[PDB]
Write a protein that binds this ligand. Structure first.
Ligand SMILES: N#C[C@@H](c1ccc(F)cc1)c1cccc(C(F)(F)F)n1
Lengths: 546, 164
C-alpha cells in the first residue's frame, strides 16, 4: 500500500490533499468495492469497502480524506511453552504444570460419491490461545511448543471504529475518534483535511508489554527473524494491563506513533520511523515500530516529496502512473558498466542490449529489460556484501546504492548472476521484441487485458503482483482502489479508479469497464455532490423497501 | 420491516445509497453489493463458515489458497457460536442495524435474481445470509493480521508420539 497526505505548507492551494493507493488482492475476501453512503444531515462519505461490511474503509467526506496501509506493528504474539517433562500435553507456568485444553470441531466433507463424511478435529489451546506448528521452526516436541495469542480476537470495536471514521469532520476529529476507540486492527491511517492538516497514525490494536519487560520476555533468536515471540513459561510475560487502553492487554493510544504536520506524511508499509524524515518517529516498543531500512517504494516517494516545490494533484497521480522501477536507480547504472566491460560475451549480449534499451519503467510498452532486471535482482538479493554503499542509519534515504564492482569476487558473482538471470529469461517462451504489457495481464472471461505496474519489491509505486499462468503473468494483487482527493471550495474533488472494476461477476456490465481504463491509466471523477451525480449521463436510480 | 433505501448508480456501477437510518442504509448497501458480487460473497461466507469441504470437497482451495478442510477446521474453530454471540452482544445498536439491513438487502436481491448479473445462480451454496455471516466475515478479516496467517500451523498442531 502507498499513502501520501499533503499539508497547507506544501500543496499548490494551501489546502489538504490525499493520495490513496492501497495494495490488496484482486479477488476474494478483501476485494475493494466502491460506494457512497448518505444519511442526510448526519453521514455523507464515499470510498471503498470490503466484502460484507456496511462501512466505508478508505474514502472521504466534505472536509476529510483518509486511507490505510499495512503497518509493521505486531498484532499477535507467539509464546514458547516449556512442556511438563512428564507430559507433553501439559506446560509449565512459573514451574506449575498446567493442562492443555482441547476443543473439537466437526466438519462435513463431500466425498467422491457426493455423500457427506464427518471429520472431527482436535484443537489444543493454552492460556494464551491455540498451539501452532511450523515444521522445522516451531515444533511441538517433548520439551517445547508454541501458542499464538492474536490481539484482534477480542477487538469487537472494528465496525464501530470505521463507522465512526465515516462520520469524522476533520483530521483532529478523526484522530480523536481513532484514539478513543482503538478499533483499527492492523493498518496505519493517513489523512488530510480542508484546513490543510496532514496526519499519520500507527494507531491499531497492538499487544502491550511494558518496556522493561521486553529484554527478558523476548525469545532473542525468534525476534531477530521478525517474529514477536515471548517466553510462555513466566507469568510476567503476559500482556501488561493499563487502564488507559480500550482493551485489556493492548497498547494505549498515547504510546502509538502519531505525526501531525502541514507539509507531508507518507507510508509504504515500512515502520513509523521515516513517515516524514524532518521528524523521525523513534523510541517505540519493538512491538510497535523499529527503525529499519525502508523499502524502495518509500525511498522513491521520499525522493519525490522532499524539497520545497509545491505538490500538485497531478504530481501525486504521476507518481503512480509513471510505473518507474525505482530499484533500477540503485543498480542499473553499475550493472550497465559491467555490461560495457563485458561486450562480446556471447551469453550476456541479449541481456545487456535489453537493459540499455529499457525505459526503467513497468509500462505497457516497457521493454524486456524489466524481465531481465527482475530475475537479475532476485539473484542479486541473495548475494553477500555486493552493495557499493551499504545501508547506513545516517543516510536512510540514499542507501544502499550501487554495485561494488571494485571488489573482484563480487564482480564475478554479479556477472554470474546476470548470466543466470539471462539464461532463465531466454529459456522461457518470450517472443522477441515483446513488451511488459504483452506478458502481465488480467483475465476477463476469455479475453485478457494488459496491466501496467510491477512488484513493489522492485520500487514500482504502482505495485502489481502477478503469478505464472499458462503463457502469461496473471495479476493477483496490488493497486486496487485509487483515490486522489483535494478540496476546492465547491466540494471535495476526487479522482481515481477501482483497478479490477465493481463486479467479480463475468456477466456484469461492470466486470471490466474500469479495468480497461486502468490498463490505459485514465483515472476518472469520483462523483460526490448531488450536482456531480446528476451531471452523470449514465445515472440510474432505484428505490426499494420491504 | 421499516427497511428502505434510495440507490443511485453513476458511471461504472458505483452505488450512492441514501436512507434515513442505519437499517435502510445497510439495506441499500447489501442490495447494491449483491447485484455486483453475490457469488463472491456467498463463496467467502462458505469459507468463513468452514463449509468449503461440504460443498466442494477436500480437493480445492479457498480464495486465500488454503486447502478446503484445513481452512474449514480453522474457521469453525474461529467462528464458534459463543464467539459470534459475544461478538454480536458487543456491537452498538447502529452497527447492528447496519448489519441487519445488509443481510436483508442482500437477501432481497437473491430473491429477485434471474442471472442477469449472477453466474452462480442455482448453485446450492448461493443462499440467504444472516448477520452471523457478516460477523464471520468480520472476524475472518480481523485475524488476517494475526492467527489467520497461522491457520495451517494451527491445524497441524499435534502432540508428539513415541519418536526418538
Ligand atoms: N486492518 C484491517 C483489515 C480489516 C479487518 C477487519 C475488518 F472488519 C475491516 C478491515 C483490512 C483488510 C483489508 C483492507 C483494509 C483497509 F484498511 F481498508 F485497507 N483493512
Amino acid at each position: 500500500s502507498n499513502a501520501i497526505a499533503v499539508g497547507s505548507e506544501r500543496s499548490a492551494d494551501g489546502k489538504g490533499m490525499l493520495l490513496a493507493n492501497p495494495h490488496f488482492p484482486w479477488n476474494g475476501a478483501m476485494r475493494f468495492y466502491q460506494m457512497h453512503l448518505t444519511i442526510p444531515g448526519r453521514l455523507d462519505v464515499m470510498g471503498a469497502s470490503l466484502p460484507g461490511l456496511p462501512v466505508v474503509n478508505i474514502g472521504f467526506s466534505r472536509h476529510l480524506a483518509w486511507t490505510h496501509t499495512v503497518d509493521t506493528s505486531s498484532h499477535f504474539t507467539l509464546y514458547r511453552l516449556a512442556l511438563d517433562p512428564k507430559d507433553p500435553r501439559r506446560y509449565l507456568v512459573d514451574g506449575r504444570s498446567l493442562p492443555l485444553e482441547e476443543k473439537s470441531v466437526a466438519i462435513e466433507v463431500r466425498g467422491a460419491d457426493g455423500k457427506l463424511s464427518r471429520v472431527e478435529h482436535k484443537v489444543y489451546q493454552s492460556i494464551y490461545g491455540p498451539l501452532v506448528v511450523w515444521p522445522g521452526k516451531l515444533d511441538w516436541n517433548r520439551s517445547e511448543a508454541y501458542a499464538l495469542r492474536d490481539a484482534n480476537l477480542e477487538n469487537t470495536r472494528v465496525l464501530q471504529q470505521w463507522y465512526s471514521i465515516n462520520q469524522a469532520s476533520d483530521v483532529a476529529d478523526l484522530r480523536r475518534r481513532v484514539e478513543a476507540l482503538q478499533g483499527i486492527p492492523w493498518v496505519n491511517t493517513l489523512a488530510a483535511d480542508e484546513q490543510g492538516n496532514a496526519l499519520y497514525m500507527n494507531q491499531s490494536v497492538v499487544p502491550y508489554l511494558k518496556p522493561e519487560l521486553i529484554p527478558a520476555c523476548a525469545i532473542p533468536q525468534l525476534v531477530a527473524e521478525g517474529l514477536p515471540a515471548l517466553q510462555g513459561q513466566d507469568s510476567r510475560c503476559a500482556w501488561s494491563r493499563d487502564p488507559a487502553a480500550a482493551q485489556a492487554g493492548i497498547t494505549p493510544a498515547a504510546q502509538l506513533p502519531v505525526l501531525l504536520r502541514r507539509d507531508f506524511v507518507q507510508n509504504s508499509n515500512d515502520s513509523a520511523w521515516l513517515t516524514n524524515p524532518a521528524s523521525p518517529l523513534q523510541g517505540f516498543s519493538p512491538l510497535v515500530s523499529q527503525e529499519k531500512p525502508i523499502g524502495p517504494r518509500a525511498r522513491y516517494a521520499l525522493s519525490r516529496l522532499q524539497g520545497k516545490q509545491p505538490l500538485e494533484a497531478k504530481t501525486l497521480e504521476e507518481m503512480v502512473t509513471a510505473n518507474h522501477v525505482f530499484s533500477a536507480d540503485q543498480v542499473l547504472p553499475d550493472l550497465l558498466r559491467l555490461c560495457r566491460d563485458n561486450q562480446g560475451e556471447k551469453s550476456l549480449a541479449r541481456a545487456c542490449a535489453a537493459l540499455a534499451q529499457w525505459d526503467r519503467g513497468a509500462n505497457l510498452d516497457s521493454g524486456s529489460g524489466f524481465v531481465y532486471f527482475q530475475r537479475f535482482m532476485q539473484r542479486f538479493a541473495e548475494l553477500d556484501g555486493a552493495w557499493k554503499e551499504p545501508f547506513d542509519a545516517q543516510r536512510p534515504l540514499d542507501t544502499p546504492q550501487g554495485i561494488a564492482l571494485d571488489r573482484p569476487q563480487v564482480a564475478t558473482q554479479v556477472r554470474q548472476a546476470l548470466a543466470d538471470a539471462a539464461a532463465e529469461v531466454e529459456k522461457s517462451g518470450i517472443p522477441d521484441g515483446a513488451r511488459w504489457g504483452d506478458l502481465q495481464v488480467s483475465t476477463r472471461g476469455q479475453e485478457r487485458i494488459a496491466i501496467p505496474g510491477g512488484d513493489g519489491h522492485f520500487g514500482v509505486y504502482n505495485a502489481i503482483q502477478s503469478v505464472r499462468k499458462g503463457d502469461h503473468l496473471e495479476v493477483v494483487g496490488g493497486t486496487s482502489y485509487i483515490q486522489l482527493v483535494t478540496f476546492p471550495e465547491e466540494g471535495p474533488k476526487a479522482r481515481g479508479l477501482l483497478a479490477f472494476s465493481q463486479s467479480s461477476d463475468p456477466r456484469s456490465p461492470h466486470y471490466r469497464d474500469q479495468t480497461e481504463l486502468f490498463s490505459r491509466q485514465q483515472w476518472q471523477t469520483l462523483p460526490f455532490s448531488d450536482r456531480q451525480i446528476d451531471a452523470d449521463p449514465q445515472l440510474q436510480r432505484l428505490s426499494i423497501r420491504e | 420491516t421499516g427497511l428502505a433505501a434510495d440507490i443511485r448508480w453513476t458511471a461504472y456501477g458505483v452505488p450512492h445509497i441514501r436512507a434515513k437510518d442505519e437499517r435502510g442504509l445497510g439495506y441499500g448497501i447489501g442490495y447494491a453489493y449483491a447485484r455486483d458480487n453475490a457469488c463472491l460473497l456467498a463463496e467467502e461466507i462458505v469459507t468463513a463458515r468452514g463449509e468449503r469441504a461440504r460443498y466442494f470437497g477436500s480437493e480445492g482451495k479457498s480464495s486465500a489458497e488454503l486447502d478446503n478442510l484445513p481452512s474449514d477446521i480453522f474457521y469453525a474453530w474461529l467462528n464458534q457460536p459463543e464467539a459470534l454471540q459475544a461478538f454480536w452482544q458487543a456491537q452498538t445498536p447502529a452497527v447492528r442495524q447496519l448489519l441487519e439491513g445488509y443481510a436483508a438487502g442482500f437477501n432481497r436481491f437473491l430473491r429477485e435474481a434471474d442471472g442477469k448479473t449472477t453466474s452462480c445462480l442455482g448453485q446450492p451454496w448461493l443462499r440467504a445470509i444472516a448477520t452471523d455471516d457478516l460477523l464471520r466475515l468480520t472476524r475472518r478479516l480481523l485475524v488476517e493480521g494475526g492467527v489467520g496467517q497461522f491457520a495451517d500451523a494451527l491445524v497441524a498442531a499435534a502432540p508428539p508420539g513415541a519418536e526418538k
